[model samples]
Target chain A: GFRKMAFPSGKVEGCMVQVTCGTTTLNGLWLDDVVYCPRHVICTSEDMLNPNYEDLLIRKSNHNFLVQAGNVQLRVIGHSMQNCVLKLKVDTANPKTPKYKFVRIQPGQTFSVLACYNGSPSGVYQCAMRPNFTIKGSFLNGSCGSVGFNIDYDCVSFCYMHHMELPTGVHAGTDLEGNFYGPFVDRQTAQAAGTDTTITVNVLAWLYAAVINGDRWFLNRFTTTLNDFNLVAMKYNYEPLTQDHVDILGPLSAQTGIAVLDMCASLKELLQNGMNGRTILGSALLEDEFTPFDVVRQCS
Target chain B: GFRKMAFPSGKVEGCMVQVTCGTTTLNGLWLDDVVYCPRHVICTSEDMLNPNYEDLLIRKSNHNFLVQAGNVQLRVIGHSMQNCVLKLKVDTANPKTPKYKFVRIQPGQTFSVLACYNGSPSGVYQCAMRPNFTIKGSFLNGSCGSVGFNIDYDCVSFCYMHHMELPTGVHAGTDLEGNFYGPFVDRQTAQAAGTDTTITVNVLAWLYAAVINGDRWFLNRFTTTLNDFNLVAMKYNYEPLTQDHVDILGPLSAQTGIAVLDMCASLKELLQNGMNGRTILGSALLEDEFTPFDVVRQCS
Candidate 1:
């Protein structure tokens, strides 16, 4: 019986488990896999600096893990909430690392992490949140330690724990022109002898990881001209489109070395918006690496 | 020059080239514009072979040259020449050097040259008989002694003058078991010192070229174990895949060696296929040296 009982049967059954459009729950109805969540909700966690919060508890039901306090959801009229996606801020900005217990996003807002989020494509709610705020994650795989999932029209926050030597919270301020701007922080401490450096070094490392994974935004800025790209090769053993990995690449030949490095940086940006799953984030990162010229060349 | 031209403006005007499947003309196509003959036909020089007995010389009027007889066609089809694909009758049973030649065969056709005939994929046409029993070739192009293409069914052959040193033409053969075969020939009097010493040693020089060219078949066989891979940390100026390369891939780390090799091999193959004029074959080759596993488990 244990062997016969599989964890999850199929996509259809998974969607049938929960059905909701924002606060409206429609029981016993066909769900749309491509639901476009029109409304965006933010879950500003009071425990930003620390993720080990006694108040942030998840209930383990027969088949579902439910986090009640910071669950956020979005909805669309005709389009499925699956399509109406929400991106999370995998704020990888903390120098003093912390376990990100919860994440907060504003309503009707889109973050880069949604690109990696994967839920019931037809389910009323789909969410993927990153575990680290200092460095946003794009996919909701165990690599980033996603404990639960939900789609409620409210501010959503998940449990987080700080792991940085010098702990701090990241925040972005909206300008008069409605532009959210901040020199986003991604480091917590600088290692003595440069080995102790966390933010810049990890940022660069994550940048490389993200670009290869399919994050495009940061990919645009990466420079392959660096000497390291020539001799470095990032061998991705994971499924090129569905795994979380971070490795450095060096140049191989007469190339603009920045191609793969830029791709890594782009993927990092997507990872910072950690709500998407590995497949989305990974594929996009791969796609970003594969441009017309990139296609003509190989990644070292 | 105009008065002495073969065909004014080199045009085979008003001539329809009809390709024959068998005796019947498969198509009534014009052969005027075509630079080479696309199929196998009897090429003869009326002034030379026609007088001795009656041999049709497959000559290119444009080039006005005679094929050295016994030249194989691009494709060979027909039951008559089944056993005589490329006629060779030499003492190959002895390990000693055997003198072999090309010959023509038409079922039950016996020759007084050697004890018996041995047939292989590479046609062995009789070379002892010049102008008479010699194999006559048809040129796809309208010239003799000129490089041309010949076809028979699916087989294709390019006409190139075989140097005297080449032993009775390239040894295009398949073993009886058909397990191992290749598109190359051994022209040296004897296998070089390291040739065939070991798969790796025999192909070492070519292996490097193969790696740069991304020859998987060659590299896969050589890099038998992870230990054999050549991991290199190519510098920016020497980036092989993206630039010139440096070999940092010490005689360590399979991850580095295999990664760079794999990438270079792939890029090279792409270039050889003519998909691109040139590619980051060098850089790609160097980049593959850094395999993912090695990256994770840094050297002690």
Candidate 2:
């Protein structure tokens, strides 16, 4: 059906869409006399050179985010000073005392945050951001989530199924005795949804493949690749991963990814049916079945 | 038969004897008014404290001495002085041109010298010395005879029969290639004829006995005994014995001494008689016989 709109905008009050102006694409929605651009480049403190012109513009965008249970009343409010301002102050100190607020967000700068259940016995979290703008307050009895977005599903599931005493995915919090707690999330779903985790896992898989194949050159390249990723992460305030994390990521990638999962299933079949554990004795099966690169390629 | 002399002395012109002046014994040959005492100590260089008084005197005395073949001409010559003096010059430097001379002796001194051959390829030699005095020289046709009055027959005969490469009773002059010649004599014969080697070899036998019996006290005494022997040998200018000589002496004593030789002969008898070729296989007879000392004590 053709959509009718006032001022060449759609009439859906809660609907958002991608709009293009020349070569620039932006996420926008008409709200009364204002246009809400969810993901736009808004001038941060460093945009002083463009005093008259708007320095921040939308580069990437998103709108709807989900949180879990309780009276989760969500309000997107902004002040009508020189720009839209929504005060969002999170009670980041303690999970027990929940609070939030908002602040002004100019157009054209990138920002991000995670929103989650703040009350006791909580739910899944979602992240939201606007550059040069902050929704600051301890509101809706809510708090910002501080756990990293990137998580390993296999590490989480294996720990759960095995009932590991050590932490997995996000460290919920640690106590004096080093015990941890969590408002848990399925790491696979989180990985599938977030960028930091998705890129990291793929790079980890490539590194793991290089190792399995014993390709020194490729391994060396991956070493550099890891360095580059860490440099970027450092600049963006992301936590750097140790080799231990990379090691954990390989098995987790195989556990979660469909193709690698199938290869493992085929491997099992061969062990059970082909020689009934004859060739598999003492790594003989792998030696006979595939080259180093074959194993790496299959897993990767 | 006693012959009375006109001057209370005999004048045969070929005799010498020790005469006594009260308690002091003196060397005097009652041949003439000028009484001759072959070199005796009137004074040595150390007698300056009392130039006229006799400090050196014969402390012990033995009377008779025997010499081997040859009409050996011995002459006692002297000149009367405050102290009797005799200058003896031996032709020890050349065996071919052997000669000797004597000067006068002082009234309180005695002196003598060999007035015969002292050349090479010599006859068997003998030595004679006053019991407590010395007239030291190599005499008798270049025969190098030092004092050894106590001889072991086994040591001599074994040396003679086996032709030992080392010097025994005395070293005869050596050849150009350092192979020595012989002007040999029985060591005991040399001792009684020359010095006190009689007491020495008997002491040597005792020491050898202590060694065979492993007597520590006797061995210690032997150590001192050997020291004394060496000291006397040095005073009289005899050769000092090495341990080699002592070692040789022990076995040779067993070989020649009557008791020990008799023990061996009895041991032989038993070996020949008892079970002729029984227990000892090759030396079977008398193999079960008791020791030779046992046989000797019984047989004697």
Candidate 3:
């Protein structure tokens, strides 16, 4: 299913697929009648400094990303862009608030782009943590530098279990501050889940393997695979298609029909397996870690 | 030679000696008439973060240490020491500049102690370069953090080649800025070097030994060795009979003295031979790099 279809607003609804651009195959999105095709590229450290394209990047090192709970951060790095548009959409605690918007950032700004989900006490665990992490970074200066992302995980509380269900896949673990993570589909399920945690590192395992790695798969699954040819037709739901649709879906689409949904299925397996815990002993996972293509394989 | 004696301070002068604090034998400095025996300990990464002692620390990663010219930097770190008193003695040019003085540093301050030897025009190559690198660090953060040292290479312009003479033992090469580094004492000669250095990596030769690993007596120029028994006496040379010093120096002193000097002598030999310039490829020095102890021992 197209991920955006799940969004209440049909404004940017699209299939998560891929499209061909000259020699490069990229992640594509299918917008409804108004606009047809769009694609999202996963930006890399190199991409920001010397770009390939603009997409989402989450820096785990200093971002304290999970430490503060429900939040997503995207700061500027490398050469600043001039008049570049950064589109954003996020679901915070309040339903009345807008989930989609874009903010202009100045060149060399401290936090060129940002957002946080400060947890609500009376609210469910999904939204019960502060969104902010500090700014300017002293603990990790040079070596612990920044990466650029088209956007962050501004969609959920970093608390949502995505498409998974109850009883089958369980809460992997709690974070640094002892907050329960996942196995929840919504506010009710999250609040109802029990809280018995494991070692602090166990949470890191989930983080390293499931969330970050899983997110990486989301951003890269299409670009790195032959996903475009494999699953675009399903995008139209056996409906009509035209060349303008792809031209319109231009920057946002998927490589496969199941690309978006598989993000959850794979995440469930990784969490259950305890992630790559062996490497998490002394340090956190290395961002830009080796993220293997779990779903698709190429033959020699 | 005792490092400080070369300082010409004359006030704090004596042998480059060692003393025993209970069971630990450490690098000690001797003062003529004033404070008798003082030890200078080398601080490590772990030491500063959880400080064991106060000493000189050069954070090679971010200090941009070698980038600027003649200067030295020692920053503060770890728990704030309330009246821990840091002592300083430097010989910056302008004969008028006070050579010995300590500044009070506030707790949790940016830079509690600092001094730069901005080079001079009439100063010759040794002293002609601004001794400043940008402050605060944005390059390599946590991974490229700080190390606190009691002092930096303020003795000479990270220039003066200590002890070693030219025409014979020459410089290995220049530093990041084409500054000459040594034939001088290991520490100070670092001033003149260039960064447009090597292949950034080396191949280094494998030092292989034969003769069932050589059971041969190599003739010694004989000037450097001190057989046992000279041990107990090595303690009384600069000062008069101090039996306490005697207790620690006896028997243990002879071989230990040889071991200390042996390193400089051996490295001086290997480096000139361009030790492992081939296998030492790409990465820097190997920690457990090979070197024959070269001591004479035969059981035939």
DockQ, Cα level, model 2: 0.00
Point out the worst 10-residue segment of candidate 2 chain A by lDDT.
A1-10
Instruction: DockQ each candidate and list the results.
Output: 0.01, 0.00, 0.01
Instruction: Give me the iRMSD of candidate 1, please.
Output: 33.1
Instruction: Give per-model CA RMSD.
Output: 28.9, 55.0, 27.6
Model 1 scores a C-alpha lDDT of 0.22
Mark the 10 consecutive residues where model 2 chain B has the least summed lDDT.
Answer: B1-10
Residue-level error in angstroms, candidate 1, position B72: 88
Which sections of candidate 3 miss by over 4 Å? A1-273, A276-300, B1-145, B148-300
> Between 1 and 2, whose DockQ is larger?
1
lDDT of each: 0.22, 0.24, 0.20
lDDT of 3 by residue, B94-147 (tens): 222222322222111111111111110100000111111111111110011011
List the candidate 1 regions with Cα displacement exceeding 4 Å.
A1-300, B1-300
Which docking class does model 1 fall in? Answer: incorrect
Instruction: Tell me the TM-score that candidate 3 gets on chain A alone.
Output: 0.18
**TM-score to native of every candidate shown:** 0.16, 0.14, 0.16
DockQ of predicted candidate 3 = 0.01
